[PDB]
Amino acid sequence: NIKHETDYSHDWTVEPNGGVTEVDSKHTPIIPEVGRSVDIENTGRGELTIQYQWGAPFMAGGWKVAKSHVVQRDETYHLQRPDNAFYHQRIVVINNGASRGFCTIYYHLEHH
Numbered sequence: 411n412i413k414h415e416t417d418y419s420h421d422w423t424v425e426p427n428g429g430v431t432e433v434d435s436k437h438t439p440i441i442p443e444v445g446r447s448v449d450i451e452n453t454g455r456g457e458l459t460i461q462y463q464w465g466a467p468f469m470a471g472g473w474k475v476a477k478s479h480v481v482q483r484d485e486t487y488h489l490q491r492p493d494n495a496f497y498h499q500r501i502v503v504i505n506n507g508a509s510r511g512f513c514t515i516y517y518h519l520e521h522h
Contacts, residue, residue, distance in 0.1 A: 424511030
């Protein structure tokens with residue numbers, strides 16, 4: 411009795427020499443919420459960093475890093491969301507290298 415479920419994906423570019431691309435975001439300023447996990451497939455020639463970031467109410471003190479991981483070319487990596495709830499959160503992909511960055515993000519949706 412296998413069932414098909416639908417998730418989302420999206421392709422992204424990340425500029426070289428410090429580009430940052432936002433690939434997910436959530437703002438829940440009244441009641442905080444747990445976020446969403448993703449997988450990243452690096453489809454470019456150089457490495458990328460993926461980070462899970464959070465912010466306090468009013469973004470006081472700017473974004474903070476909860477998780478970070480480096481993904482090499484052709485690899486796919488699962489970024490599990492933190493177990494705690496946030497007022498602001500996002501996932502970014504950062505390209506600190508000289509090669510243009512490319513990736514596909516697979517978003518793990520909520521299923522019941």
